[PDB]
From a paper:
PpsR acts as a repressor of photosynthesis and tetrapyrrole-biosynthesis gene expression by binding to palindromic DNA sequences (TGTc-N10-gACA) present in the promoter region of PpsR-regulated genes.
The main dimerization interface is formed by the N-cap, its connecting loop to the PAS core (residues 156–161) and β51. The 20 N-­terminal residues are disordered and could not be modelled into the electron-density map.
Residue numbers in the entry:
A (entry chain A), B (entry chain A): 143 to 257
Write the structure that this text describes.
């Protein structure tokens, strides 16, 4: 059940063509992502896991960026933040949604190209 | 951990814009899906959960259809089956991938419009 649902989660995230990054509300760090997100961000999973999400985006810092996404996720309008990914040099639209798991909050962020 | 990973799975599947249906290899029935899949199939989650996947598609039967998807998933080429969804009357492309969880196999099927 632990491993069962873990396995379902892993496969659905990996197979999904929707570019997604999962971010810790506590630390602002990337806790998971899929390869579609990796492609838009310009990095492999191994480089992005554990990385501060704000530092992937030019001119952003953890405090303000996490506050921005937290506030946007509260509008429940799928409102996006416009960003520029340092590695890929692609302008992107990031749409955050907050949910609770294991006593903490995570932000599931969808990524789309902006241009 | 059971609930934690279950919660992650639920949210990722629901939020993902990639239309996905999860099918039991054992029964050929739909065990899960997201609303993007529901839209293409022409049914709500409540009508589709527990339904035989083959019976959603005109002219298909469980035996041959499950054998078709199982064989296609083995080619590892993302080869699609062309189908016509009874409820929505949309021609679709279904791409199956097989994985193991909790001692059984599931097919995670991506759905795309065909026309």
């Amino acid at each position: 059940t632990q491993r069962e649902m873990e396995t379902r989660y892993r496969v659905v995230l990996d197979v999904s063509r929707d570019p997604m990054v999962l971010v810790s509300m506590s630390t602002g760090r990337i806790v998971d992502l899929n390869s579609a997100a990796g492609l838009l961000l310009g990095g492999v999973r191994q480089d992005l896991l554990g990385a501060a999400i704000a530092q992937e985006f030019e001119g952003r810092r953890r405090g303000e960026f996490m506050e921005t996404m937290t506030n946007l996720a509260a509008t429940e309008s799928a409102a996006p933040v416009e960003v520029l990914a340092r590695r890929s040099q692609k302008r992107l639209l990031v749409v955050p949604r907050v949910f609770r798991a294991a006593g903490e909050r995570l932000l599931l962020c969808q990524i789309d190209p902006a241009d």
